[PDB]
Amino acid sequence: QDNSRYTHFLTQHYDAKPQGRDDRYCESIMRRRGLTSPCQDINTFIHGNKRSIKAICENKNGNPHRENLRISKSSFQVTTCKLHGGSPWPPCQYRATAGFRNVVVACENGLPVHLDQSIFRRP
């Protein structure tokens, strides 16, 4: 209930220095982060350092966006893992897509607590 939404944000969407950002990378980090009981169908990780991600909450590196979101001014190395196979039960098979662009998050008390996945559900 307190700042735990932010640490959960880090757990779900942050990875400081991934290695290869290939399929195997996805399948492994998605398991290690526990987004595998029902297999999450899409999930994106942001790379780089925490300070600049947090700064998306201030005008320093963010802009108000849509209803209540914030869009970053800078771009981030990012990797999106998409479930492949339909069945939502393990084994969870992921296809990885590395990318570089700004992100949309929701802030709370000056901290990111939500990553908007729609801009990566790139069709």
mmCIF file with all atom_site columns, C-alpha atoms in Angstrom:
data_model
loop_
_atom_site.group_PDB
_atom_site.id
_atom_site.type_symbol
_atom_site.label_atom_id
_atom_site.label_alt_id
_atom_site.label_comp_id
_atom_site.label_asym_id
_atom_site.label_entity_id
_atom_site.label_seq_id
_atom_site.pdbx_PDB_ins_code
_atom_site.Cartn_x
_atom_site.Cartn_y
_atom_site.Cartn_z
_atom_site.occupancy
_atom_site.B_iso_or_equiv
_atom_site.pdbx_formal_charge
_atom_site.auth_seq_id
_atom_site.auth_comp_id
_atom_site.auth_asym_id
_atom_site.auth_atom_id
_atom_site.pdbx_PDB_model_num
ATOM 1   C CA . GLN A 1 1   ? 0.000  0.000   0.000   1.00 0.00 ? 1   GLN A CA 1
ATOM 2   C CA . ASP A 1 2   ? 3.033  2.310   0.481   1.00 0.00 ? 2   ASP A CA 1
ATOM 3   C CA . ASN A 1 3   ? 5.789  2.747   -2.134  1.00 0.00 ? 3   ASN A CA 1
ATOM 4   C CA . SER A 1 4   ? 5.268  -0.935  -2.743  1.00 0.00 ? 4   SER A CA 1
ATOM 5   C CA . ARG A 1 5   ? 3.576  -0.041  -6.036  1.00 0.00 ? 5   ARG A CA 1
ATOM 6   C CA . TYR A 1 6   ? 6.860  1.543   -7.145  1.00 0.00 ? 6   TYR A CA 1
ATOM 7   C CA . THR A 1 7   ? 9.048  -1.427  -6.161  1.00 0.00 ? 7   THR A CA 1
ATOM 8   C CA . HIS A 1 8   ? 6.525  -3.623  -7.940  1.00 0.00 ? 8   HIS A CA 1
ATOM 9   C CA . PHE A 1 9   ? 6.959  -1.358  -10.984 1.00 0.00 ? 9   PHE A CA 1
ATOM 10  C CA . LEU A 1 10  ? 10.729 -2.006  -10.907 1.00 0.00 ? 10  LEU A CA 1
ATOM 11  C CA . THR A 1 11  ? 10.104 -5.730  -10.585 1.00 0.00 ? 11  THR A CA 1
ATOM 12  C CA . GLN A 1 12  ? 7.757  -5.824  -13.551 1.00 0.00 ? 12  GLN A CA 1
ATOM 13  C CA . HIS A 1 13  ? 9.433  -3.327  -15.876 1.00 0.00 ? 13  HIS A CA 1
ATOM 14  C CA . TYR A 1 14  ? 13.020 -2.653  -15.011 1.00 0.00 ? 14  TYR A CA 1
ATOM 15  C CA . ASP A 1 15  ? 16.282 -4.423  -15.869 1.00 0.00 ? 15  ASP A CA 1
ATOM 16  C CA . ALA A 1 16  ? 19.388 -2.252  -15.622 1.00 0.00 ? 16  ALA A CA 1
ATOM 17  C CA . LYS A 1 17  ? 21.690 -4.171  -17.994 1.00 0.00 ? 17  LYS A CA 1
ATOM 18  C CA . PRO A 1 18  ? 20.206 -7.055  -19.925 1.00 0.00 ? 18  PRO A CA 1
ATOM 19  C CA . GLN A 1 19  ? 22.583 -9.228  -21.901 1.00 0.00 ? 19  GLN A CA 1
ATOM 20  C CA . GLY A 1 20  ? 21.269 -10.388 -25.231 1.00 0.00 ? 20  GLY A CA 1
ATOM 21  C CA . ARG A 1 21  ? 17.757 -9.123  -25.626 1.00 0.00 ? 21  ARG A CA 1
ATOM 22  C CA . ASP A 1 22  ? 16.673 -12.195 -27.541 1.00 0.00 ? 22  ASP A CA 1
ATOM 23  C CA . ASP A 1 23  ? 13.779 -14.664 -27.099 1.00 0.00 ? 23  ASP A CA 1
ATOM 24  C CA . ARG A 1 24  ? 15.658 -16.699 -24.452 1.00 0.00 ? 24  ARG A CA 1
ATOM 25  C CA . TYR A 1 25  ? 16.248 -13.484 -22.583 1.00 0.00 ? 25  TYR A CA 1
ATOM 26  C CA . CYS A 1 26  ? 12.511 -12.886 -22.411 1.00 0.00 ? 26  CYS A CA 1
ATOM 27  C CA . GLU A 1 27  ? 11.648 -16.431 -21.346 1.00 0.00 ? 27  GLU A CA 1
ATOM 28  C CA . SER A 1 28  ? 14.210 -16.274 -18.615 1.00 0.00 ? 28  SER A CA 1
ATOM 29  C CA . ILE A 1 29  ? 13.538 -12.814 -17.090 1.00 0.00 ? 29  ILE A CA 1
ATOM 30  C CA . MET A 1 30  ? 9.778  -13.350 -17.295 1.00 0.00 ? 30  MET A CA 1
ATOM 31  C CA . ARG A 1 31  ? 10.263 -16.508 -15.194 1.00 0.00 ? 31  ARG A CA 1
ATOM 32  C CA . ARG A 1 32  ? 12.668 -14.899 -12.734 1.00 0.00 ? 32  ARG A CA 1
ATOM 33  C CA . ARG A 1 33  ? 10.261 -11.978 -12.255 1.00 0.00 ? 33  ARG A CA 1
ATOM 34  C CA . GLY A 1 34  ? 7.338  -14.314 -11.664 1.00 0.00 ? 34  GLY A CA 1
ATOM 35  C CA . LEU A 1 35  ? 5.121  -13.077 -14.506 1.00 0.00 ? 35  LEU A CA 1
ATOM 36  C CA . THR A 1 36  ? 4.526  -16.676 -15.413 1.00 0.00 ? 36  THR A CA 1
ATOM 37  C CA . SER A 1 37  ? 1.653  -18.294 -13.382 1.00 0.00 ? 37  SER A CA 1
ATOM 38  C CA . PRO A 1 38  ? -0.775 -17.294 -15.876 1.00 0.00 ? 38  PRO A CA 1
ATOM 39  C CA . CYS A 1 39  ? 1.621  -16.343 -18.687 1.00 0.00 ? 39  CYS A CA 1
ATOM 40  C CA . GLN A 1 40  ? 1.440  -12.515 -19.093 1.00 0.00 ? 40  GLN A CA 1
ATOM 41  C CA . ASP A 1 41  ? 0.703  -11.968 -22.789 1.00 0.00 ? 41  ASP A CA 1
ATOM 42  C CA . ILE A 1 42  ? 2.893  -8.871  -23.257 1.00 0.00 ? 42  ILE A CA 1
ATOM 43  C CA . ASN A 1 43  ? 5.384  -7.159  -20.987 1.00 0.00 ? 43  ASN A CA 1
ATOM 44  C CA . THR A 1 44  ? 8.080  -4.593  -21.531 1.00 0.00 ? 44  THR A CA 1
ATOM 45  C CA . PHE A 1 45  ? 11.310 -3.955  -19.647 1.00 0.00 ? 45  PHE A CA 1
ATOM 46  C CA . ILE A 1 46  ? 13.102 -0.632  -19.582 1.00 0.00 ? 46  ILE A CA 1
ATOM 47  C CA . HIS A 1 47  ? 16.907 -0.579  -19.446 1.00 0.00 ? 47  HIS A CA 1
ATOM 48  C CA . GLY A 1 48  ? 19.347 2.030   -18.197 1.00 0.00 ? 48  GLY A CA 1
ATOM 49  C CA . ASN A 1 49  ? 19.363 3.675   -14.796 1.00 0.00 ? 49  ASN A CA 1
ATOM 50  C CA . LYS A 1 50  ? 16.565 4.286   -12.326 1.00 0.00 ? 50  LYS A CA 1
ATOM 51  C CA . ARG A 1 51  ? 17.110 8.019   -11.843 1.00 0.00 ? 51  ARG A CA 1
ATOM 52  C CA . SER A 1 52  ? 16.077 8.939   -15.394 1.00 0.00 ? 52  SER A CA 1
ATOM 53  C CA . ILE A 1 53  ? 12.999 6.706   -15.221 1.00 0.00 ? 53  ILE A CA 1
ATOM 54  C CA . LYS A 1 54  ? 11.903 8.390   -11.950 1.00 0.00 ? 54  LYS A CA 1
ATOM 55  C CA . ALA A 1 55  ? 12.485 11.813  -13.566 1.00 0.00 ? 55  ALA A CA 1
ATOM 56  C CA . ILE A 1 56  ? 9.638  11.105  -16.014 1.00 0.00 ? 56  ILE A CA 1
ATOM 57  C CA . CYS A 1 57  ? 7.425  12.087  -13.094 1.00 0.00 ? 57  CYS A CA 1
ATOM 58  C CA . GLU A 1 58  ? 8.836  15.631  -13.008 1.00 0.00 ? 58  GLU A CA 1
ATOM 59  C CA . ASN A 1 59  ? 8.915  18.145  -15.843 1.00 0.00 ? 59  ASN A CA 1
ATOM 60  C CA . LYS A 1 60  ? 12.602 17.293  -15.951 1.00 0.00 ? 60  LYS A CA 1
ATOM 61  C CA . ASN A 1 61  ? 12.026 14.301  -18.243 1.00 0.00 ? 61  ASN A CA 1
ATOM 62  C CA . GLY A 1 62  ? 8.262  14.077  -18.658 1.00 0.00 ? 62  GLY A CA 1
ATOM 63  C CA . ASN A 1 63  ? 5.173  15.671  -20.169 1.00 0.00 ? 63  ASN A CA 1
ATOM 64  C CA . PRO A 1 64  ? 1.540  15.277  -19.069 1.00 0.00 ? 64  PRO A CA 1
ATOM 65  C CA . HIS A 1 65  ? -0.108 12.784  -21.380 1.00 0.00 ? 65  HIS A CA 1
ATOM 66  C CA . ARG A 1 66  ? -3.652 11.681  -22.218 1.00 0.00 ? 66  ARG A CA 1
ATOM 67  C CA . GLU A 1 67  ? -5.902 11.539  -19.161 1.00 0.00 ? 67  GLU A CA 1
ATOM 68  C CA . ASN A 1 68  ? -3.530 11.087  -16.215 1.00 0.00 ? 68  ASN A CA 1
ATOM 69  C CA . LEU A 1 69  ? -0.256 9.795   -17.678 1.00 0.00 ? 69  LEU A CA 1
ATOM 70  C CA . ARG A 1 70  ? 3.246  11.107  -18.322 1.00 0.00 ? 70  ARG A CA 1
ATOM 71  C CA . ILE A 1 71  ? 5.304  10.575  -21.473 1.00 0.00 ? 71  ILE A CA 1
ATOM 72  C CA . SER A 1 72  ? 9.108  10.792  -21.255 1.00 0.00 ? 72  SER A CA 1
ATOM 73  C CA . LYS A 1 73  ? 11.110 13.375  -23.113 1.00 0.00 ? 73  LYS A CA 1
ATOM 74  C CA . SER A 1 74  ? 14.077 11.049  -23.621 1.00 0.00 ? 74  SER A CA 1
ATOM 75  C CA . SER A 1 75  ? 14.196 7.645   -25.298 1.00 0.00 ? 75  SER A CA 1
ATOM 76  C CA . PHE A 1 76  ? 15.026 4.394   -23.491 1.00 0.00 ? 76  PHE A CA 1
ATOM 77  C CA . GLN A 1 77  ? 16.460 1.086   -24.607 1.00 0.00 ? 77  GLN A CA 1
ATOM 78  C CA . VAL A 1 78  ? 13.560 -1.264  -24.142 1.00 0.00 ? 78  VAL A CA 1
ATOM 79  C CA . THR A 1 79  ? 12.660 -4.913  -24.790 1.00 0.00 ? 79  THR A CA 1
ATOM 80  C CA . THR A 1 80  ? 9.186  -6.175  -25.252 1.00 0.00 ? 80  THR A CA 1
ATOM 81  C CA . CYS A 1 81  ? 8.307  -9.824  -24.564 1.00 0.00 ? 81  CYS A CA 1
ATOM 82  C CA . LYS A 1 82  ? 5.217  -11.176 -26.324 1.00 0.00 ? 82  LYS A CA 1
ATOM 83  C CA . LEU A 1 83  ? 3.609  -14.461 -25.384 1.00 0.00 ? 83  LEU A CA 1
ATOM 84  C CA . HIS A 1 84  ? 3.652  -16.814 -28.334 1.00 0.00 ? 84  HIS A CA 1
ATOM 85  C CA . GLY A 1 85  ? 1.293  -19.774 -28.439 1.00 0.00 ? 85  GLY A CA 1
ATOM 86  C CA . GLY A 1 86  ? -2.042 -18.670 -27.011 1.00 0.00 ? 86  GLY A CA 1
ATOM 87  C CA . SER A 1 87  ? -2.204 -21.038 -24.017 1.00 0.00 ? 87  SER A CA 1
ATOM 88  C CA . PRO A 1 88  ? -1.774 -18.819 -20.880 1.00 0.00 ? 88  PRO A CA 1
ATOM 89  C CA . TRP A 1 89  ? -0.309 -21.672 -18.861 1.00 0.00 ? 89  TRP A CA 1
ATOM 90  C CA . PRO A 1 90  ? 3.391  -22.580 -18.745 1.00 0.00 ? 90  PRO A CA 1
ATOM 91  C CA . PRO A 1 91  ? 5.604  -23.251 -20.475 1.00 0.00 ? 91  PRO A CA 1
ATOM 92  C CA . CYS A 1 92  ? 5.418  -19.546 -21.409 1.00 0.00 ? 92  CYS A CA 1
ATOM 93  C CA . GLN A 1 93  ? 6.956  -18.992 -24.852 1.00 0.00 ? 93  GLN A CA 1
ATOM 94  C CA . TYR A 1 94  ? 8.167  -15.453 -25.606 1.00 0.00 ? 94  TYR A CA 1
ATOM 95  C CA . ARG A 1 95  ? 9.267  -13.560 -28.717 1.00 0.00 ? 95  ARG A CA 1
ATOM 96  C CA . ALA A 1 96  ? 11.532 -10.588 -27.946 1.00 0.00 ? 96  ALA A CA 1
ATOM 97  C CA . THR A 1 97  ? 11.527 -7.180  -29.603 1.00 0.00 ? 97  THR A CA 1
ATOM 98  C CA . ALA A 1 98  ? 14.246 -4.760  -28.733 1.00 0.00 ? 98  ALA A CA 1
ATOM 99  C CA . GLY A 1 99  ? 13.412 -1.100  -29.265 1.00 0.00 ? 99  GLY A CA 1
ATOM 100 C CA . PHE A 1 100 ? 14.456 2.494   -28.507 1.00 0.00 ? 100 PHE A CA 1
ATOM 101 C CA . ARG A 1 101 ? 11.891 5.252   -27.786 1.00 0.00 ? 101 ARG A CA 1
ATOM 102 C CA . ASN A 1 102 ? 10.123 7.228   -25.032 1.00 0.00 ? 102 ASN A CA 1
ATOM 103 C CA . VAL A 1 103 ? 7.805  5.640   -22.550 1.00 0.00 ? 103 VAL A CA 1
ATOM 104 C CA . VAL A 1 104 ? 4.445  6.321   -20.934 1.00 0.00 ? 104 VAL A CA 1
ATOM 105 C CA . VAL A 1 105 ? 4.048  5.746   -17.212 1.00 0.00 ? 105 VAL A CA 1
ATOM 106 C CA . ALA A 1 106 ? 1.628  6.769   -14.441 1.00 0.00 ? 106 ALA A CA 1
ATOM 107 C CA . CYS A 1 107 ? 3.196  8.533   -11.476 1.00 0.00 ? 107 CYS A CA 1
ATOM 108 C CA . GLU A 1 108 ? 2.188  8.530   -7.836  1.00 0.00 ? 108 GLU A CA 1
ATOM 109 C CA . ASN A 1 109 ? 3.908  10.576  -5.220  1.00 0.00 ? 109 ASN A CA 1
ATOM 110 C CA . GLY A 1 110 ? 6.617  11.366  -7.751  1.00 0.00 ? 110 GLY A CA 1
ATOM 111 C CA . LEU A 1 111 ? 7.214  7.701   -8.546  1.00 0.00 ? 111 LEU A CA 1
ATOM 112 C CA . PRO A 1 112 ? 6.343  5.473   -11.507 1.00 0.00 ? 112 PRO A CA 1
ATOM 113 C CA . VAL A 1 113 ? 3.783  2.868   -10.562 1.00 0.00 ? 113 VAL A CA 1
ATOM 114 C CA . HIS A 1 114 ? 2.409  1.901   -13.948 1.00 0.00 ? 114 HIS A CA 1
ATOM 115 C CA . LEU A 1 115 ? 3.763  1.323   -17.466 1.00 0.00 ? 115 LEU A CA 1
ATOM 116 C CA . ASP A 1 116 ? 1.292  1.816   -20.268 1.00 0.00 ? 116 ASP A CA 1
ATOM 117 C CA . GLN A 1 117 ? 1.696  -1.311  -22.460 1.00 0.00 ? 117 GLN A CA 1
ATOM 118 C CA . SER A 1 118 ? -0.422 -0.050  -25.344 1.00 0.00 ? 118 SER A CA 1
ATOM 119 C CA . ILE A 1 119 ? 2.361  1.801   -27.159 1.00 0.00 ? 119 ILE A CA 1
ATOM 120 C CA . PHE A 1 120 ? 4.275  -1.484  -27.417 1.00 0.00 ? 120 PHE A CA 1
ATOM 121 C CA . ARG A 1 121 ? 1.365  -3.649  -28.445 1.00 0.00 ? 121 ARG A CA 1
ATOM 122 C CA . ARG A 1 122 ? 2.839  -2.491  -31.732 1.00 0.00 ? 122 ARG A CA 1
ATOM 123 C CA . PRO A 1 123 ? 0.654  -4.138  -34.413 1.00 0.00 ? 123 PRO A CA 1
#
